Structure formats: structure tokens, C-alpha cells
Amino acid sequence: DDVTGEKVREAFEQFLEDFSVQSTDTGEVEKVYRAQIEFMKIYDLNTIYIDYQHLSMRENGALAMAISEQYYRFLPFLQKGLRRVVRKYAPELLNTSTERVFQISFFNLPTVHRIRDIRSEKIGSLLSISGTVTRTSEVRPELYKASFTCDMCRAIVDNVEQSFKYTEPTFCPNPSCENRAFWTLNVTRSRFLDWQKVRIQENANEIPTGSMPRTLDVILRGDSVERAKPGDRCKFTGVEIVVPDVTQLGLPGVKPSSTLSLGVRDLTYKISFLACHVISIDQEVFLNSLSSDEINELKEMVKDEHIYDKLVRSIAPAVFGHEAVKKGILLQMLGGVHKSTVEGIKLRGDINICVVGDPSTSKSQFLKYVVGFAPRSVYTSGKASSAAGLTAAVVRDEEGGDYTIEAGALMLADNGICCIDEFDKMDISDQVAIHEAMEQQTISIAKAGIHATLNARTSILAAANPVGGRYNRKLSLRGNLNMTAPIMSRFDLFFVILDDCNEKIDTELASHIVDLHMKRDEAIEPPFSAEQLRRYIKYARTFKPILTKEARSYLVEKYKELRKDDAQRSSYRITVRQLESMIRLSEAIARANCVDEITPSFIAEAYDLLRQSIIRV
Amino acid sequence: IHESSKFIDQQFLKLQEIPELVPVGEMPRNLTMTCDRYLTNKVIPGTR
Amino acid sequence: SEIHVRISDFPTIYSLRELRESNLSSLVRVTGVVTRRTGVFPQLKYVKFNCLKCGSILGPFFQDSNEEIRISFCTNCKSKGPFRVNGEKTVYRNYQ
Ligand SMILES: Nc1ncnc2c1ncn2[C@@H]1O[C@H](COP(=O)(O)OP(=O)(O)O)[C@@H](O)[C@H]1O
Ligand SMILES: [Mg+2]
Ligand SMILES: [Zn+2]
Ligand SMILES: [Zn+2]
């Protein structure tokens, strides 16, 4: 036995039992831990949230140091201590109704170490790692406690808990056996733990110069499974564990080995991470999540006389001189109402914008600004991307193994804006591929034994230079683009950006740019910060604007005028797709003004946007 | 003793359901068959 | 030879990702879209192992669907060799 382990276990029990602290100004001195024991008993939960600072304040941090430095050995001792604490206080929830496997998920650790910063000395210790979720596995049952049936002296014996390696009971229900031939498991009596292996990439910001993003495989168990999202930045807290590796046998350098009749085992390992706490880095739900400070900010923000213009000027601070493009990007960010018909048709409810313009017109700047600002957004370039990248892909589970689905760019931008930079240079096959998904919002993979139907409700923001690298004055927009007229028809807004030799605008833009290089910040101050914008967009998204009966007429005559005006030759011909687009923009405008009913002003704004977007030859 | 033995011909054909009468969303289903002696080399592939 | 009972209208409905492990050895009602069929395959239902040491075939033993039972010892003559199956006498069941 180990004296230190038992002593630390009982010290942990005592510290938990006598934990004390003042609770704010109200609640007096509240034993937060002991009271939260019954708080989680109310729902009979399985997690006990051990904030690190609590464990750190006591015993001058010696208990925290012992737990962090040698967590793997202490964890069963802490489990026994927690069971004893439940026995002494609040024993009403111990039974599952065998015994619930309570999870001790630490958090609020001092520092978070990157994937590149993982070290071989700190294995067996507790830390936090931050990375991007790229591949996740199924929720496969994992054998934790097993029931074994002895081939000899046959019977059923449970409570033979499973270790990391297979374990079978040496003692038998009939002791005369003492033989372990074919100890057989059974479904109804064995105990299992939920399991999930999530692959994480190194974050882009922390990538070393001239290096590839190092990856890692993270194990999820208990109630923490199925929490991460592919393409969602998340932090993982737990212990570094080693797992057997059969690949690194031909690598240079000597190898660990054993001798016991050769009695030799080839010993290689690769480092993984077992995680306990993972977090992601109705309008009433969003309102409930909203704090009152913001709720009231929102109230004066909502009751502003001119909220549309102030929202427009608050988007894309870096770019100067483009207002209609800012309006379009704002509408795309807000989105639209996804409506389903009784006959099965799923009406499109997101805005797709193709921005064409002369070189050096902040188009790439718009796309870069949108990403990193719009939640669940992906930025890609035209040439360095493929269909397996834009759409979902198929790749092996592990090297020399079966294949699996790979998260594509479109899905990583599901219910988000995907920014496709340099659309024209991107290959025609991948063009068919992106457009095919855009038509039905669903990307299907039918290769290598997988026929999953993968949906992607993504608004596409496309940028492309005119053919020849310069807009032809004579030719139209369709004549200066390499995509087809149906591709024009699918896309909603065409913001053809042009360059002109106007002295005033040149002087003002030069002043703006040299000031932006001058004042690293405060060069231009948008009325609304990122947080306020994000929240407003989130709140507006929750509302679902409804079309009033009166505005339907105004739509009808506006579409009549739109059909009459052209070809009485323009960039895009007038079709019904346009009338759908008129609503698609109207719902976004209504969401912007935080209104619930469509008014003729909204149709006026949408028709203004569509009449300005169309360009005379 | 191979010089005093006697042998027979055996052939493995494969049968697939006629592609005309196939459910639209499903791959065709095939069947493995054997064959012996005078039935061997009686059908070329592509014969109903 | 046998009859079956098909339960309908179970109260609780769980999605595939929500099965977790508590639903183990439990009746569940889930919905989805069918993707792949594996055809119709005969599966052993009433297997009759034969004992060449006895002289003839043994009795029809019910085959558990969890795993394939084996004749390690012949309870009659203690034969270690013959535990094969005769596809003519064996009664099969559909499987997909
Ligand atoms: N209206 C503008 N406002 C702010 N910056 C601009 C503007 N026009 C050009 N620029 C600047 O000049 C550069 C142009 O880059 P950009 O237009 O995004 O490349 P591309 O034309 O290939 O999309 C950027 O640094 C951008 O900030
Ligand atoms: Mg560009
Ligand atoms: Zn035994
Ligand atoms: Zn026998």
C-alpha cells in the first residue's frame, strides 16, 4: 500500500467537508461545495465541479500541487473519498435507481498549454489544451465494469471492473476452479461507459512559422461526450495519457523493450489526452442568456430612430466608400426565414452574394472581415481548394484502416457565412460541385462504403475578379464573368465594384488608409462594437418576420415594374427567382430594424438594393 | 498418385438480377453459382 | 414452427445520436432514413451438429443469436473431432 495516497485522499475528504468561503455580499458564508452536492443531487447529476482555486487556496496549494502533478494515481483515491463524503452527507443519490459513476471535472486551471506545447514530462498531470475540433467519432460503449462467466465451474460473476487492459477474475464463485479459461461477458449484467475519440487540430494563431498544424486525439467519457462541434474552437481539461502505437517501429532510435523464452514486448506509445471538461471557445433562451446590462443597452439600441444606418456604418470599419456592399453583407449575416412547403419544397432562407470588382477594391478585405467575426464561418481561396475541401470528404479513420467522413468547408460553415475568395480561378469541376450543393443545400457522399446524407445550410459570399483582370466598359456583368447565366440566377446580389479617377475620393481614401496605418486603433471608430453587433444579430435572428397582407400587393407591382424595366440588356434578366429574392431581402431588412411585420418601406429598401445592384451596360 | 487419378471440370458463374427490373435507389443483387462436368462453358457472360 | 410479436407505439422516441449507453438492453423507438441493405442471408436457427464418432447426427440444438455454440465434448461418447453442421437437416432463418 501507499501511505501518501491514502493521506492525500483523506486530506481531500476533509478539505471538501469543511470547505468555507464568504458568498458575495448575500448568502453569508456558504459552503458552496457541500450545498452544491445536494443541488446536483436534485437532478441526480454525475459531475462534481471542482474549481481549481478552491483546491489551491488550502494547504498553501500543496493539495493542488499533489493532485496536478500525480493525478493518475490519486484519482481512484479521490473517487473513494467522494463516495465516503456522499456516505456521510447526502447518501440519497448514491444508487443509480448500481452506483452512479460520479465525474470530477476540474476547471479554472492557471494556464492552457497548446498542442505544440505538449511535453513528455508532464504526462500523468492535469492541464488544459485549446484546439480546433476537426474529426469526432461515434458514441461507442466502453467497458468499465464487466460480468464474467467462468468456462470452468460455470456461473455469473459481476463487479469485475475493466482496467485499461483486459482483466478477468482469478477467483471463482466455486473456488475449486481457480481457472480462467473462457471467462465470458454478458450484455445484461456488464457495465459500460460512454466513449468518444475526438481529433483536434492546432489553432491557426498558434501555428509555428513554417510548420504544419500538429493534431491530437482526445478521449471523451461520461456526460462530456457529444459536446464538441467540428470546426468549433474548444478547450479540453484532463490528463495526458499514452496509448499503444504500432506504427513507430521502423523509426530511427532505440526502442523500449522487456525481457522475461524470449519474453519480449515491443514497447511504443503515442501521446493522447483524456478530457473531463470541454467548453466551446426561442428568443427567450437568448434573452435569458443575455445579461440585463446588455438587455437595457439593447432596449435603447432597439428603440433608436435610425438603427439601419447605424448598423450599416458599424459593419466593415476598415473599408471606406462602399455602403451598398455593407448593407448586403449585413443582410447576409442576419439571414432569412427558412420556410418549408406542404408539398416538400424547402424554400431558401439564406442570402448568397457574389461580389465582383476591379483589383484592389477591398473584396478580399470584406471576406477577411466577415470571417473571424461571423460565428461558424470559413474563409477559402479559389485555387487552393477542392471539392473534398469545400464539401465533405472521405478519409481513413486511422492510417491503414477503414475510411470515414471528413468535415468539409461547407459544413464547417453550416448556418454561417462561407467566404470564397477568387471564385473565378477555382476549377470548373469544383464550380459544378459548389453550385450543386447551393441548389439543394445538401451534399451527399456515396464512396468507400459510406452513403451519408450531409446537409449544409450555408450562405455563400463569393468574390471574383472580372475576366482579364479589369472590367470591360463595353461588356455587361455577365459578359465580364466566366460563370453561366443560371449561376447568376441562383445568386441573389451582384455588387459590381468599379474603380474611377475621382480626385476627391482618391484623396479621401488615401487619407483613410494612411490614417489606418497611422492610428493602429481609433483611426475610425464604428458606432457599435463587435460584441453589441454580434448580440444584436443573434437577437434579430431569433425573431421571424412575417409578411403583412398589404405588403404583398406592393411586392406584386414592384415585380411587375422589375419585369417591365429590363429588355424594354442588363446584368441579370428578370425572373421569378428575383421575386423570391425580394422577400429574401425583405425578411433580412425587417430583422435588421428588429421589426416583426413586413412594411412597404422594407420592400422599398430591397427593391432599391436590387435596382442599384443591376448595372446598365 | 496423380498419374492414376481422374478429374472433372468445375466452373464458377455469377448471376445478377436483370438491370431492367431493379429498384431505382438500390444496387443490383448478384448470386454466386457453381457448375460441373458437361454444364461447363455453356454460357458466355452477358447472356440471359 | 415459431411465432413472433411485434410491439408498436412505444412512448419515448430517441434520435440515433441520443442512444448513449443507458438504453442498453432496452426497448427503443428510433426513426431515420434507410441507407444500405445487405440482401437476404440465411442464418442458422435449428442447427444439428453431427457426431461422426457416434455414427450419425446429434440432436437439433437451438442456436443462440449472440454467438455460435460449439460441441467441445460429446455428452454421449465424448468426441472431440466431429462438431460439423449438415445444411440439409439444419433449419435456417432469414437475416438482413
Ligand atoms: N475602399 C477601400 N477601403 C479600404 N481599403 C481599400 C479600399 N480599396 C482598396 N483598399 C486597400 O487596398 C488593398 C486592396 O486589397 P483587396 O481589394 O482586398 O484585394 P482584391 O481586390 O484582390 O480583393 C487592401 O489593403 C485594402 O485595405
Ligand atoms: Mg482579393
Ligand atoms: Zn472458475
Ligand atoms: Zn458422440
Same domain, A67 and A149: no
Whether A297 has its CB under 8 Å from any CB of chain C: the answer is no
Sign of CA dihedral A454, A455, A458, A460: positive
DSSP-assigned beta bridge partners for residue A340 = A346
Chain C partners within 8 Å of A451 (Cβ):
35-36
Distance of CA A591 to the CA centre of its chain: 24
A274 and A350 co-located in one domain: no
CA nearest neighbour of A609 among A381, A360, A308? A308
A524 and A415 share a domain?
yes
Q: Which residues of chain A neighbour C33 with C-beta distances below 8 Å?
A: 453
How many domains does the structure of chain A reveal?
4
Identify the sign of the CA torsion A92, A95, A96, A101.
Answer: positive
- Report the CATH number that the domain containing residue A339 is assigned in CATH: 3.40.50.300
Distance of CA A549 to the CA centre of its chain: 39
CA A140 to chain centre: 22
Please tell me whether residues A160 and A209 are part of one structural domain: no
Q: Do the chains A and C touch each other, judged by at least 3 C-beta pairs below 8 angstroms?
A: yes
A320 lines ligand 1 (CB under 6 A): yes
User: Are A187 and C17 inside 8 Å of each other by CB?
Assistant: no
Say if residues A149 and A183 touch (Cβ distance below 8 Å): yes
Is A286 part of any domain?
A: no
CA of B2 to the centre of ligand 4 (A): 36
Identify the closest residue of chain C to A192 by CA–CA distance: C21
The answer to whether position A256 is within a domain reads no
Do residues A311 and A213 both lie within one domain? no
DSSP bridge partners of A95: A99
- Which of these, A378, A362, A384, lies nearest to A419 by C-alpha position? A378
Domain ranges, residue C65: 45-91
User: What CATH number should be reported for the domain holding residue A207?
Assistant: 2.40.50.140
Last residue of a domain, one of A281, A309, A331: A281
Q: Return the bridge partners of C46, or none.
A: C62, C91
Cβ contact B–A (≥3 pairs, < 8 Å): no
Q: What is the rounded distance in angstroms from the CA atom of residue A137 to the CA atom of residue A394?
A: 14
Residue at A261 is within a domain: no
Q: How many residues does chain A have?
A: 617
What is the DSSP pairing of strand A378-381 with strand A47-51? unpaired
Residue type, A403: Y
* SS3 per-residue string spanning A472-493: CCCCCCHHHCCCCHHHHHHCCE
Do A187 and C66 count as a contact with CB atoms less than 8 A apart? Answer: yes
Residues A549 and A478 in one domain: yes
Ligand 3 center from residue A154 Cα (angstroms): 6
**Contact list, A187 vs chain C (CB under 8 Å):** 24-25, 66
3-state secondary structure of A322: coil
Cα–Cα distance measured from residue A407 to residue A410, given in angstroms and rounded to the nearest whole number: 8
| Cβ A592 vs Cβ A606: under 8 Å | no
Provide residues of C within 8 Å CB-CB of chain A.
17, 19-21, 24-25, 33, 35-36, 66
Q: Do A239 and A179 belong to one domain?
A: no
CATH of the domain at A48: 3.30.1640.10
Cα gap A339→A545, rounded to integer Å: 12
Q: Is A44 on the interface with C (CB under 8 A)?
A: no
Regarding the beta carbon of A355 and ligand 1, being less than 6 Å apart is answered: no
- Clarify whether residues A543 and A446 are in a common domain: yes
Instruction: Compute, in angstroms, the gap from residue A335 CA to the centroid of ligand 2.
Output: 24
Element (H, E) at A52: helix A52-57
Tell me whether residue A42 is exposed, middle or buried, using C-beta atoms within 10 angstroms of its C-beta: 0 to 12, 13 to 18, 19 or more: exposed
Which grid coordinates belong to C60? Answer: 437439433
Residues A444 and A538 in one domain: yes
Q: What is the DSSP letter of A454?
A: E
Instruction: State the number of CA atoms in the 13 A half-sphere of C45 facing the CB.
Output: 10
Nearby residues of A218 by Cβ (< 8 Å), 6 or more positions away:
A129, A197, A198, A199, A200, A236, A238, A272, A273, A274, A275
Residue at A260 is within a domain: no
**A144 touching C, CB under 8 A?**
no
Pocket test for ligand 1, best of A361, A369, A514 (most atoms within 8 A of CB): A361
Q: Ligand 1 centre and the CA of A572: distance in Å?
A: 26
Three cell numbers at A125?
Answer: 498531470
Mutate to test the pocket of ligand 1, among A362, A363, A421 (most ligand atoms within 8 A of CB): A362
C-alpha cell at C90: 439444419
Contact A192, A141 (CB under 8 A): yes
Contacts A194 to C, Cβ<8 Å: 20-21
| Cell numbers found for residue A232 | 468549433
Nearest ligand to the C-alpha atom of residue C73: 4
Q: Which of A148, A144, A146 is nearest to A181 (CA)?
A: A148
| For ligand 1, mutation pick of A313, A365, A502, A514 (most atoms within 8 Å of CB) | A365
**What is the domain range of residue A187?**
141-193
Given its phi and psi angles, is residue A415 left (phi above 0), alpha (psi -120 to 50 degrees) or beta? Answer: left
Distance from CA of A545 to the nearest CA of C (A): 30
Asked whether residue A116 falls in the same domain as residue A105, the answer is: no
Nearest to A82 by CA among A101, A63, A95, A67: A101
Å resolution of this model? 3.8
**How far does residue A532's CA lie from ligand 2's centre (Å)?**
28
Contacts of C38 in chain A (CB under 8 A): none
Mutate which: C18, C19, C20, vs A, most A CBs within 10 A: C20
- The grid cell for A178 is 481457480
- Shared domain for A319 and A462, answered yes or no, is yes
Rg (CA), chain C: 19
Whether A477 maps to a domain, the answer reads yes
Shortest-distance atom of ligand 1 to CA A366: 18
Residues with Cβ < 8 Å from A554, sequence gap 6 or more?
A600, A603
In contact, A170 and A190? CB cutoff 8 Å: no
- The verdict on whether residue A360 carries a ligand-binding annotation is yes
Contact present, C82 and C51 (Cβ < 8 Å): yes
A110-139 residues touching C, CB cutoff 8 A? 139
Q: With a 6 A CB cut-off, is A469 part of the ligand 1 pocket?
A: no
The reply to whether A125 sits in an annotated binding site is no
Distance CA A116, CA A203 (A): 10
Tell me how far CA of residue A503 lies from CA of A83, A515, A583, in angstroms: 78, 18, 39
- Rounded to the nearest 10°, the torsion over CA A315, A316, A317, A320 is -120
DSSP chain C: ----------S----GGG-TTTTTTS----------------EEEEEEEE-TTTSSEEEEEEPPSSS----SS-TTT--SS---B-TTTSEEE---
On the 0-12 / 13-18 / 19+ scale of CB atoms within 10 A, C69 is middle
Experimental technique behind these coordinates: cryo-EM
Q: Is the dihedral of CA A205, A209, A210, A213 positive or negative?
A: negative
What is the crossing angle of helices A324-334 and A363-370, to 10°? 30
Q: Are residues A409 and A515 in the same domain?
A: yes
Residue A533: alpha-carbon gap to chain centroid: 20
* Length in residues, chain B: 48
Question: Using the 8-state DSSP alphabet, how is residue A58 labeled?
Answer: G
Domain assignment present for A382: yes
